[PDB]
Amino acid sequence: TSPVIGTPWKKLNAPVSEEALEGVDKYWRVANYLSIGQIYLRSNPLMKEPFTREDVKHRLVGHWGTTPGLNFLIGHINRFIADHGQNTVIIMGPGHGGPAGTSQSYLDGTYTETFPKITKDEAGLQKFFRQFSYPGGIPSHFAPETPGSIHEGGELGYALSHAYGAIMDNPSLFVPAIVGDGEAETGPLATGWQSNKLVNPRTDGIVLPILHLNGYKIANPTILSRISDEELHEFFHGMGYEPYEFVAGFDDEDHMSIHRRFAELWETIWDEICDIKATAQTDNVHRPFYPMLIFRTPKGWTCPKYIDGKKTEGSWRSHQVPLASARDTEAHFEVLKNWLESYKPEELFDANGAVKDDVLAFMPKGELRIGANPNANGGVIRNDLKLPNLEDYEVKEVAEYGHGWGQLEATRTLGAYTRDIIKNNPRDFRIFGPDETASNRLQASYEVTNKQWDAGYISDEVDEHMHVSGQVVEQLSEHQMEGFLEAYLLTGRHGIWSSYESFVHVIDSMLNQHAKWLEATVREIPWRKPIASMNLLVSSHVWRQDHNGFSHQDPGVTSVLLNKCFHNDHVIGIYFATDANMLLAIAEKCYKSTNKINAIIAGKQPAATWLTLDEARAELEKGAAAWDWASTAKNNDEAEVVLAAAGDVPTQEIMAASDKLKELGVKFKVVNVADLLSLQSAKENDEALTDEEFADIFTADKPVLFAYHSYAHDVRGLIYDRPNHDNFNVHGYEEEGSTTTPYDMVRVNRIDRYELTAEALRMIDADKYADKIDELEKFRDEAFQFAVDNGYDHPDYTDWVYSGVNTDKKGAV
Amino acid sequence: TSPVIGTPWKKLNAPVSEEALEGVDKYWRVANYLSIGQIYLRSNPLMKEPFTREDVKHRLVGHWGTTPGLNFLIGHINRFIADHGQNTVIIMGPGHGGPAGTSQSYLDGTYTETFPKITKDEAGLQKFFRQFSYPGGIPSHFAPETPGSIHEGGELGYALSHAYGAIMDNPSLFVPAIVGDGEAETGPLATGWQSNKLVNPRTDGIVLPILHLNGYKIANPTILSRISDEELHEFFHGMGYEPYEFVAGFDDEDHMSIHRRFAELWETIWDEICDIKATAQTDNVHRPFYPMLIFRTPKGWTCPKYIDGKKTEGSWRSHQVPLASARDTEAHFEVLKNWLESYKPEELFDANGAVKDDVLAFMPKGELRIGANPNANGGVIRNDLKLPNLEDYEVKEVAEYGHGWGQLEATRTLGAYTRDIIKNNPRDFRIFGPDETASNRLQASYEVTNKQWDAGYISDEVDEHMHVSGQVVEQLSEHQMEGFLEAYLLTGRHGIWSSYESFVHVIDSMLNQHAKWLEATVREIPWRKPIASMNLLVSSHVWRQDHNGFSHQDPGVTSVLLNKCFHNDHVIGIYFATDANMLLAIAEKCYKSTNKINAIIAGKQPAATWLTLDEARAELEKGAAAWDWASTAKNNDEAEVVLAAAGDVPTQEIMAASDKLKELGVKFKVVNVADLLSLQSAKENDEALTDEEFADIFTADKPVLFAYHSYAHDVRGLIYDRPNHDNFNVHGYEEEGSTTTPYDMVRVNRIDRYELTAEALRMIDADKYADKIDELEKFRDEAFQFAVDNGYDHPDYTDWVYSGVNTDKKGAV
Ligand SMILES: Cc1ncc(C[n+]2csc(CCOP(=O)(O)OP(=O)(O)O)c2C)c(N)n1
Ligand SMILES: Cc1ncc(C[n+]2csc(CCOP(=O)(O)OP(=O)(O)O)c2C)c(N)n1
Ligand SMILES: [Ca+2]
Ligand SMILES: [Ca+2]
């Protein structure tokens, strides 16, 4: 569970010292100066004579606008951390403000501790300034390469769901979440404000949202800066906050005076947080109004007010570079030089180029430093889950009654296994669900915990399995669920979420950002220790969207995830739970894994169980397997066709086609694929099947009928250099279906058992089996018309039980 | 331009008549009866003796919970439309309340007009009940197959961006937008409330958001129903609404009394809307507080209160079916029978099984009916745009200086063309951007229009090109931009939006829903006429994300769009603008198209122009072409290698590699691909290249080096059955890059000009070209060291001009 760090939720009980605040102003001055140097300066970081256009970067890249306001907040937050001993992680929503977070880490000393070549002297500063957004150097954003970051803020919107995930089961943590006012325009951010109804102030930490109301985005004003101030406070109050508002920088108020006003507001806010935390030790059943700060300052604060007659400070024009180039003209260079001198760096750095002791005496120390706090590198907190014995959850009936036994709903087995994970690991594992945890059948967890709910309660007739603290959280928002789990992982904990397959797409771009975080981490950030994997049960899938139809039919998250499988990063798993025992084999592997996104595609509908647990774990190891017990062919050379499947429903249809083919005396081999990436080119992926193993499973030269859960294009793109790839006939989802029967869903996508029997026969010998093909094609129409006449499927389809099941016996019928 | 329909914004000036209200209660009762019949009954719709379990559907599919609340609001909306002659489209947020939208259309008489077999008598009604969510019947949701729908509501979240897009430039239209309280938990819905700062009450219509606060989602209460009522009102007021609340159904109040209170509230709300509209004719520069309605009623309203001892009315338990089976026991069947009787259908239908005249005398007639209004079938409003002459925008320099001339920023040309489309079609065409309109270089439109902004103004030094009415809209939300445009198309108008390439994935699931909407329509909804296409400029793309790095590098919308290319639907366009002339060629074609989603991938960075407009149109017709002026091989059999490209940057790299291969004496053919689906299997796609045309462009047997803009997996899966596909060496984006130089971006993805020259030589004869290959690989290293050392790219990379340009002539370089 999360460490208790420092002395949490302690009041100052004294005014902030004049000396601490002179410190904060020096910090702000040197952070701004560092921030400008990074964007503008390729050499001569301290402007030693002569300081010339020659010292300016050729391509100016970086964002000034947000930066001075981030520097101001971070200096004040550092002062606060130090005075109070407060366990603090920031979330920099405007992550394009990267130079604010690298400057922080440089100033707190974690930069040089982590990057020993970047030294606390003039030569380290020259390197520091040059490498920023520079080839061979470091990103423009508050990237994973920077100590103190758990949130890059490149794709906007996710600041609040990450802040709130972070504080979950983390009662000593405080998260100042800085939210851009443009970012507050996004849908994910807008809903993220409401997270305060889903945390508990005794058993979780505290989020202080800070709206960075600097009044502009790239080329527009922001909605929230331009509505009435009274509508702005009502909005936040309506969302369960106590809004406080600070305005500064719009007139000639001297900076010390601003710091004094701000530190005093900050302490009042903090007193209120401390009251909330103390009350919560006694009463954590009535939701408080949590403070939030409206921080209203001019965008680009402290840069030149006007440049070439254009308003710059306090404008969208300051967004990127306020001085657009300083290499082109003498006069532009001069504006740059005067801007950098305005911070009076000769008072901030010693003759050696180190920042002075009196600039940083106010800073926190040790693990309370923003860049050093372990919650910002949660891999160092994460330990292996204590897992229950996998064998305890096995579907034992395959071993007793045969392959293909039963009508289990597979995800219930993951339900029972996860419940015992939670029991063994209280406070370290969460489930999230956009109002679908019971619908995906994970509700066995309610035997040991509850849905966490901190809005009103009204009656034991409707409020079941909810309590103000619990390890399951639901809100109808894929953004919140994904974001909450991401940050729970990044702070060193574990969990799973589930979603209807088609709506996983709502968060494709979040999956992309988390994959890229992981890709960068495993490639070049070895100090950022492995975090637990983001595990996503993809269920209520395409083939069985019973109550819903066409808009709910989209298994293409497979396609999106394939765009993050390069370079042997291994940060993606794509799995098809063939049945419940395969689902156990996949879950155990994913729950042990670290630094991945695992999509575990599994059916919640009644279905056959194909494999014993031992057989599933053996299959999963390579990722695909022949099923000798299912094949009529004695070896590869004798197979007339390969019947291959990935997905619980494709496997069902392939299995049923295999019984029909057996009846016709066909010789064939059955293959099952459970890990999509086992099929990937062996030269791109050093964990995939070797060309030799692949040819052994699929044959060097027989026709391969492959029934795929998602879009056929996935498999086609993947196997393009594999032996025998030209003999693959890949069937998959084809954008057909509606509100219908199970048979009809497979029929209209050409993947039903009958069509599969026909296809195999056409691939073997079309003229010879022409009458058999024609009669299967007619039966497809007879079975559809049966569904239309009757409202349920043909008994040939529903009553089929694989020939492998002992239907002579007890409870096998 | 939108039709002015009826007599808009008129007050009643009298109480609603007791008679109109008895009609509303009857509508409510018979719509409830029709909704239950659809969910539960396969025959005997009027419960004629004997009425038994045999009349009940074997599989109960559908959603009751939201439905009686929808039916109530719709009866009352129907009374209001009749009484006022008000041009009205509803948005059904809880689109799973399909039975209400179908019930509505059956009642207003549109269903029988559109579906003549579904008659208004017993036999028609039996068919109506049976077909609902049933194999061979109609969907579970308010699908495009329903008259009156322009919003399915399958994936929740979009009710409000659609409502607001629908009213833009549509000053007589009124949109009651019904939003689920669960749906309001989603990111996209939460930011949609803010659209009231982006519309104008004189030049646009009026949305009335109606929060369907029934207290539950699937398995949970809802946040907004369980916070204090005082917070609920502050929240809506802080977002610029005047909130009004109605509560009913929680006690024994009789129904007529509920209807009287509601009609009175509705008229008061309406009078405030009429005042807002009348004031707006005089003062439209001060934003009003727009009414919204909080409609708080028990979920499942009017179903049995308890079933089997469980609370059902006023519970999440009523979400799907409140009575889970009505075939299993006599007792359950009996509950269904009593629930059906409780509406007294013996008073609602005549002996013929037609709904009686007194039930519906209060209803609206003609084009004002919810099902008949042309805004709910915008294709009948849409006319072709008046396009300016394409040749006016041509980059003429190619014709004068040669292929490869210049350093134009291609999207500026589209910007100029779009400016004059707006000028020629004022009030009929819009540009949307998530704060990226000027960034993607579409700003020439500000010469004929302005960004629409209805929040505060402060100063002409920051407020440029903004006006309270205008044809460009920006908010930093891809869900808002896509949603506004969708509904602007669905109501018969035109436009375009632009996005950074990587952040298109934010709205992948909106693209999916809209593509499924177009798929169902082109397949089987001939009466829903063609709407203009959803055109998306995808720019600031992966190869040139200069200010930004790795989070901004993801061209994978291509891969998402390929999952919607089946069945010859032709609802997807995927285009690569090779240069500004191809961009013109693509745009013209997109702007003329209907019933599509067009992705237009185009570069905003400085780049060569390859083609004349005539050549670009010619290539685009077929989608791919050989470039004979660029080839050294005289015909195919003499080609040593084919150099193929898709995308402006791949084309640039290929062309520079081709100048290098010329110098080495190599004989090669150069191919360009502008339309990705030109490559699709000719069995799947009847507009694709036939295999002959394909083999003729790509050769039947020579090596094919293909530089692709996006992920290589796309192209490989597409061409899996094409002749010569095994000889394709496809390079594309590979999840590498950071904040770095143009050359470094292509190098690290193995698609730079030097690596491509090397791959070409490896493919022809690795041993003969060993030295040259080795020299090319050393130079990739040297060109990167030069970027690290200097901060900009090697003059060999930077200074290259295609040998096809006449550099002798004065203005060519
Ligand atoms: C989802 C998403 N869309 C678009 C962008 C492009 N973008 C980068 S910065 C920015 C403006 C951000 O403004 P704000 O949230 O106000 O930050 P600030 O004024 O502090 O720099 C935009 C639109 C993005 N980064 N993320
Ligand atoms: C984006 C999205 N996620 C999940 C679902 C699954 N879903 C369908 S209905 C529903 C509950 C919605 O409740 P609400 O908006 O309160 O509608 P109502 O109570 O009026 O039936 C959910 C979660 C969905 N349709 N869309
Ligand atoms: Ca801002
Ligand atoms: Ca609801």
CA atoms of A726 and B85, how far apart (whole Å): 64
Distance from CA of A732 to the nearest CA of B (A): 11
Cα–ligand 2 centroid distance for A374 (angstroms): 38
Of B441, B396, B439, B391, nearest in space to B419 by CA: B441
Q: Which amino acid is at B281?
A: Q
CA atoms of A291 and B167, how far apart (whole Å): 37
Looking at the DSSP assignment, which residues form a beta bridge with residue A728?
A704
* Chain A residue numbers touching B226 (CB-CB < 8 A): 197, 455-458
Complete DSSP assignment for B651-712: HHHHHHHHHHHHHTT--EEEEEESBGGGGS-TTT-TTSPPHHHHHHHH-SSS-EEEEEEEEH
| Residue B379: DSSP 8-state | G
Tell me the pairing of strands A624-626 and A668-673.
antiparallel
| Ligand 1 site, residue B235, Cβ cutoff 6 A | no
* Chain B residue numbers touching A221 (CB-CB < 8 A): 453, 455, 458, 462-463
Q: How far is CA A419 from CA A431, A433, A445, A669, A760, in A?
A: 10, 15, 4, 38, 43
Cα–ligand 1 centroid distance for B147 (angstroms): 40
* Chain B residue numbers touching A483 (CB-CB < 8 A): none
B796: enclosing H helix or E strand: helix B795-798
Asked if residue B142 lies in contact with residue B150, where contact means CB atoms within 8 angstroms, the answer is no
Closest ligand to residue B213's CA: 4
Backbone phi, then psi, for A96, in 5-degree steps? -60, -10
Tell me the pairing of strands B310-311 and B466-467.
unpaired
B788 to A455: CB separation less than 8 angstroms, yes or no: no
Task: Identify residues after which chain A is interrupted (C–N over 2.5 A).
Answer: none
CA atoms of B560 and B601, how far apart (whole Å): 14
Of A567, A557, A440, A445, nearest in space to A505 by CA: A557
B311 to A461: CB separation less than 8 angstroms, yes or no: yes
Structure tokens at B548: 């930004």
Backbone phi, then psi, for A291, in 5-degree steps? -55, 150
CA atoms of B39 and B129, how far apart (whole Å): 7
Distance from CA of A357 to the nearest CA of B (A): 33
Backbone phi, then psi, for B701, in 5-degree steps? -150, 0
* Residues less than 5 Å from ion ligand 4, measured at CB: B 180-182, 214
B474 to A726: CB separation less than 8 angstroms, yes or no: no
Of A499, A371, A440, A291, nearest in space to A92 by CA: A371
CA atoms of A13 and B740, how far apart (whole Å): 49
Distance from CA of A615 to the nearest CA of B (A): 31
Cβ within 8 Å of residue B749, ≥6 positions away: B731, B732, B733, B734, B736, B737
Backbone phi, then psi, for A407, in 5-degree steps? -140, 35
* Torsion sign, CA atoms A674, A675, A681, A686: negative
Dihedral (C-alpha) A163, A169, A173, A176: value to the nearest 10 degrees? 20
Going along chain B from its start, the domains and CATH numbers come out as 1-397 (3.40.50.970), 398-623 (3.40.50.970), 624-813 (3.40.50.920)
A476 to B438: CB separation less than 8 angstroms, yes or no: no
Within 10 angstroms of residue A499's Cβ, the number of other Cβ atoms is 25
| Ligand 1 site, residue A218, Cβ cutoff 6 A | yes
Cα–ligand 4 centroid distance for B216 (angstroms): 4
Task: List, in sequence order, the alpha helices (H) in A440-546.
Answer: 478-490, 508-524
Task: List, in sequence order, the alpha helices (H) in A447-507.
Answer: 478-490
Backbone phi, then psi, for A508, in 5-degree steps? -50, -45
Q: Provide the edge-to-edge strand list for the sheet that holds A472-474.
A: A466-467, A451-452, A472-474, A429-433, A494-500, A534-539, A597-601, A572-576
Give B285's Cβ-side CA count (13 Å radius).
3
What is the atom index within ligand 1 of the atom nearest the CA of A96? Answer: 9
B216 annotated binding-site participant: yes
Closest ligand to residue A96's CA: 1
Of A513, A507, A521, nearest in space to A567 by CA: A521
* Torsion sign, CA atoms B716, B721, B722, B728: positive
Strands of A185-278 (E only): list them.
206-213, 241-247
Structure tokens at A331: 């006069």
CA atoms of A528 and B548, how far apart (whole Å): 22
Backbone phi, then psi, for A607, in 5-degree steps? -155, 165
A58 to B791: CB separation less than 8 angstroms, yes or no: yes
What angle is formed at CA B532 by the lines to CA B531 and CA B538, rounded to 5 degrees? 135
CA atoms of A100 and A72, how far apart (whole Å): 9
- Prior bond of B298 cis (ω within 30°): no
What is the atom index within ligand 1 of the atom nearest the CA of A184? Answer: 15
Q: How far is CA A22 from CA A79, A259, A364, B281, in A?
A: 11, 9, 15, 56
Asked if residue B372 lies in contact with residue B147, where contact means CB atoms within 8 angstroms, the answer is yes
Method: X-ray
Backbone phi, then psi, for A779, in 5-degree steps? -65, -35
Looking at the DSSP assignment, which residues form a beta bridge with residue B570?
none
Asked if residue A241 lies in contact with residue A162, where contact means CB atoms within 8 angstroms, the answer is no
Asked if residue B209 lies in contact with residue B167, where contact means CB atoms within 8 angstroms, the answer is no
B182 annotated binding-site participant: yes
B58 to A311: CB separation less than 8 angstroms, yes or no: no
B490: enclosing H helix or E strand: helix B478-490
Helix A648-663 × helix A753-765 angle, to 10°? 60
CA atoms of B479 and B192, how far apart (whole Å): 8
Tell me the pairing of strands A306-307 and A310-311.
antiparallel
- Prior bond of A243 cis (ω within 30°): no
Polymer length of chain B: 813
Q: Which amino acid is at B556?
A: G
Best residue among B437, B462, B476 to mutate for probing ligand 1, ranked by most atoms within 8 Å of CB: B476
Structure tokens at B561: 């769009």
Determine the residue of chain A that is closest to B57 in CA distance. Answer: A791
A567 to B735: CB separation less than 8 angstroms, yes or no: yes
Can you tell me which residue has the tokens 């260079």? A333
CA atoms of A35 and A174, how far apart (whole Å): 26
Can you tell me which residue has the tokens 């005249």? B357
Asked if residue B435 lies in contact with residue B476, where contact means CB atoms within 8 angstroms, the answer is yes
* Chain A residue numbers touching B477 (CB-CB < 8 A): 185-187
CA atoms of A278 and A283, how far apart (whole Å): 9
CA atoms of B361 and B356, how far apart (whole Å): 9
Structure tokens at A139: 């990103």
Distance from CA of B359 to the nearest CA of A (A): 31
Backbone phi, then psi, for B600, in 5-degree steps? -115, 100
Cβ within 8 Å of residue A622, ≥6 positions away: A678, A689, A693
Task: List, in sequence order, the alpha helices (H) in B149-295.
Answer: 159-167, 187-192, 223-226, 229-238, 255-280
CA atoms of B585 and B328, how far apart (whole Å): 63
CA atoms of B474 and B476, how far apart (whole Å): 7
Within 10 angstroms of residue B204's Cβ, the number of other Cβ atoms is 23
Cβ within 8 Å of residue A596, ≥6 positions away: A518, A533, A534, A570, A571, A572, A573, A590
Q: In chain A, what's the furthest Cα-to-Cα distance? A: 96
A646: enclosing H helix or E strand: strand A641-646
Determine the residue of chain B that is closest to A183 in CA distance. Answer: B476
Helices (H) and strands (E) in chain A, counts: 26, 22
Start-to-end C-alpha separation, chain B: 46
Determine the residue of chain B that is closest to A745 in CA distance. Answer: B135
Polymer length of chain A: 813
Cα–ligand 4 centroid distance for B226 (angstroms): 12
Complete DSSP assignment for A357-423: HHHHTTS--GGGSTTT-GGGGGGGT--------GGGG--THHHHH-TTEEEEETHHHHHHHHHHHHH
Can you tell me which residue has the tokens 């059943």? A285
A389 annotated binding-site participant: no
Distance from CA of B407 to the nearest CA of A (A): 17
SS (H, E, C) B411-434: HHHHHHHHHHHHHHCCCCEEEEEC
* Chain A residue numbers touching B310 (CB-CB < 8 A): 461
Of A745, A739, A743, A498, nearest in space to B63 by CA: A739
What is the atom index within ligand 2 of the atom nearest the CA of B157? Answer: 1
CA atoms of B167 and B56, how far apart (whole Å): 42
Task: List, in sequence order, the alpha helices (H) in A623-687.
Answer: 648-663
The helix/strand/coil state of B786 is helix
Q: How far is CA B782 from CA A380, B743, B773, in A?
A: 39, 12, 14
Tell me the pairing of strands B624-626 and B668-673.
antiparallel
Dihedral (C-alpha) B323, B327, B330, B336: value to the nearest 10 degrees? 40
Q: What is the CA radius of gyration of chain A?
A: 30
Resolution reached, in Å?
2.2
Best residue among A437, A476, A554 to mutate for probing ligand 2, ranked by most atoms within 8 Å of CB: A476
CA atoms of A357 and B341, how far apart (whole Å): 85
Distance from CA of A327 to the nearest CA of B (A): 13
Structure tokens at A743: 């048979």
B23 annotated binding-site participant: no
Of B336, B339, B305, B317, nearest in space to B56 by CA: B336
| Ligand 1 site, residue A361, Cβ cutoff 6 A | no
* Chain B residue numbers touching A510 (CB-CB < 8 A): none
A216 annotated binding-site participant: yes
Within 10 angstroms of residue B59's Cβ, the number of other Cβ atoms is 18
SS (H, E, C) B301-340: CCCCCEECCEECCCCHHHCCCCCCCCCCCHHHHHHHHHHH
Start-to-end C-alpha separation, chain A: 47
CA atoms of A157 and A132, how far apart (whole Å): 24
Of B464, B452, B431, B493, nearest in space to B203 by CA: B452
Cβ within 8 Å of residue B106, ≥6 positions away: B34, B112, B118, B120, B128
Cα–ligand 4 centroid distance for B484 (angstroms): 24
Closest ligand to residue A502's CA: 2
Label residues B407-434 b or e (16+ Cβ within 10 Å = b). ebbbbbbbbbbbbbbbbebebbbbbbbb
CA atoms of A442 and A398, how far apart (whole Å): 22
